[PDB]
Amino acid sequence: MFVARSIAADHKDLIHDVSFDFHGRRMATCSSDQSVKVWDKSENVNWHCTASWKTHSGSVWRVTWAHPEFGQVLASCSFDRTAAVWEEIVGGQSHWVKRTTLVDRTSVTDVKFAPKHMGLMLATCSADGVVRIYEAPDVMNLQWSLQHEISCKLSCSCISWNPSSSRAHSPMIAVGSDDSSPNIMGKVQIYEYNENTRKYAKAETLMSVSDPVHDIAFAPNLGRSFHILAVATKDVRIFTMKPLRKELSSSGGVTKFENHTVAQFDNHNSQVWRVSWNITGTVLASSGDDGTVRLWKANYMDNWKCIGVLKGDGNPVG
Amino acid sequence: STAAIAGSSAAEEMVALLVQAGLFDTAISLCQTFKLALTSVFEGLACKCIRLQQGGEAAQAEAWEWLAANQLATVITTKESSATDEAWRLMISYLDKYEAKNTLYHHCIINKLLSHGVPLPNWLINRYKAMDAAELLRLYLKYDLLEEAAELVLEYVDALLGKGHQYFGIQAPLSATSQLVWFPYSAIDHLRQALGENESNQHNQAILSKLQRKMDEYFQKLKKATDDYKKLVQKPLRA
Amino acid sequence: LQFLRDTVFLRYRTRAYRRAAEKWEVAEAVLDVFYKLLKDYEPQPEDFVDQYVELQGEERVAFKPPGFSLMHHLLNESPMLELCLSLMEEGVTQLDTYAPFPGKKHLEKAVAYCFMLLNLTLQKENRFMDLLRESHLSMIVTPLEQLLQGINPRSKKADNVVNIARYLCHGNSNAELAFESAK
């Protein structure tokens, strides 16, 4: 019996995105009006606009929060070919201050902070088919150093860090490929950090994702011996990735992978545009051209099913 | 022991034994007094960084002693990194700070690096490619890096066509008439020879054909720009 | 490696030596290098994977490590082995004379080297054979024990083992050799 309560946003232009902070006490919204707004949740469960500023002169494609250990930090990326880092400089005098602009050749299609145990790192991807990884050398001085350039050889549309804090797994990034490519398949690529070469190397290519990829999400690993990846294309796909075996005598490779499609769902009825896991990785949300958000969950027999569908008027489908 | 041998030393035996056992500060000081320009310190530190990156446990235990014998001006800001990152940070520092008018610099470093195996750690490269936008192409085609050499050349041509010129220290593309444009013809001819000496190699032939097609596009646009410059310079001997 | 091996072993067998002792010195010097290359080598799955480098328009199998090579040559009867086995036989024959010939020590050292080579060989043998079976390389290798069993061609009998033994008779005279032998 989910209940939705409308608020009068009164946005100058429609906001193309909303992002919660890590604690779900704050949200950021962004719009065609060239602004970002920040909203704080009162004790009475009401939202109040606490900051509003003009951010750019280009289509803000993505917004992301840093981990709260680095303070109140936002990153945004744009059609203007830049990513920007913002810090909430409060006195009640909040005024999200631009700390840097990353300027290294085409639209920056996605931006994601790395898992906190890797430090204050930011990945960007661009339609030039490059992923760039920056590091802030001082968390108190939000200067950024370009650490890595990863040539994907396909237009990058989206990126996901593997959130696994296990020291048994090298840092991993999934990347997509929007290119319609009548033929080229492999539109999801996986990169692994190689300690011996101090470089990201291509570990995997999901050859079954011959369709254009719109979004990708690694599931929270929560002690599994295998990774789970959701992929948004013309359908919703779920992959399990099992790392292969090993010998302590010597090792310098990407440790090849066994990949299985465990689910494929065409029930979207339109090019599924977004996929998002809940905080436990037990429920998937998807959105598509059918004007619905769908909720997916496995039962105790690992059988995934839909568990909810919505309407244009805002009512949940009976 | 060398206590006794310091009892009869000299202005460079010292420098060497000390650059030997860590102490990468005491010696930058002894040198800057007796003015004797020091590339042995940077080569030796680069060697220790390489040995650590391929080093065993025992090497990590010994490394904390020479790392502590320096500060590291200021340490840290987040996730830790087993030395590794430690000596590479003393790098950025002992470089940018103690730096020279000529070349105790990029060159000596890139060299000891391609010398013992290394996809170059991207900082150095990015910084010797808008300050000295070529000669490295040479360090590359010498240290048998044919693949990466063809890459650098392509990148430079791309810059020259107005695309990404800021990442190549280039001021102009088809603008402000014609000024200077150094074309690395000898390195391109070595690439053509090396691609022709591999023959069977299909991958090298695919790269060579891609490079040739791109060079032809460049020479056609260069011919047009030169013909338009000739028309521009002919207006005016009518003042 | 090639150089060393070939040249010096061939010689070690036939090439005049004004000084009779020099003959064994050359053998010792070469075998010392072989031993260090095989002992220093460790192999982890990448070794049996091999690549062909394009040199002057001809694909040539590149250069596996020192010891991948050293070891392939030991698991078959390439002369090395023979020669190693012959050197051991010669060592025991000379030692059985108990006469004070010059070079007796050098020989000891060399034979020691040989036996040590042999010893490490078995362990690493199990290992490589195993890997070798996993890598689908068309390389046929034989067990060290099987090689020990095989009758010497010149002898035309299974004296390979017999000789080794005989080194136990010199246990007072040369204990190191004795230990290795028993092992």
From Swiss-Prot, chain A:
It comes from the Eukaryota. GO terms for molecular function: structural molecule activity. It is found in: Chromosome, Centromere, Kinetochore; Nucleus, Nuclear pore complex; Lysosome membrane. One of its GO terms (cellular component) is nuclear pore outer ring. WD repeats lie at residues 10-49, 55-91, 104-143, 151-201, 208-249, 267-306. The GATOR2 complex is negatively regulated by the upstream amino acid sensors CASTOR1 and SESN2, which sequester the GATOR2 complex in absence of amino acids. In the presence of abundant amino acids, GATOR2 is released from CASTOR1 and SESN2 and activated. Pfam families: WD40. Its main location: nucleus. GO terms for biological process: attachment of mitotic spindle microtubules to kinetochore; cell division; cellular response to amino acid starvation; cellular response to nutrient levels; mitotic metaphase chromosome alignment; mRNA transport; nuclear pore organization; positive regulation of TORC1 signaling. Keywords: Cell cycle, Cell division, Centromere, Chromosome, Chromosome partition, Kinetochore, Lysosome, Membrane, Mitosis, mRNA transport, Nuclear pore complex, Nucleus, Protein transport, Repeat, Translocation, Transport, WD repeat. InterPro entries: G-protein_beta_WD-40_rep, Sec13/Seh1_fam, WD40/YVTN_repeat-like_dom_sf, WD40_repeat_dom_sf, WD40_rpt. Coiled coil: none annotated. Component of the Nup107-160 subcomplex of the nuclear pore complex (NPC). The Nup107-160 subcomplex is required for the assembly of a functional NPC. The Nup107-160 subcomplex is also required for normal kinetochore microtubule attachment, mitotic progression and chromosome segregation. This subunit plays a role in recruitment of the Nup107-160 subcomplex to the kinetochore. Belongs to the WD repeat SEC13 family. Component of the Nup107-160 subcomplex of the nuclear pore complex (NPC). The Nup107-160 subcomplex includes NUP160, NUP133, NUP107, NUP98, NUP85, NUP43, NUP37, SEH1 and SEC13. Component of the GATOR2 subcomplex, composed of MIOS, SEC13, SEH1L, WDR24 and WDR59. The GATOR2 complex interacts with CASTOR1 and CASTOR2; the interaction is negatively regulated by arginine. The GATOR2 complex interacts with SESN1, SESN2 and SESN3; the interaction is negatively regulated by amino acids. This is Nucleoporin SEH1-B. It comes from Xenopus laevis.
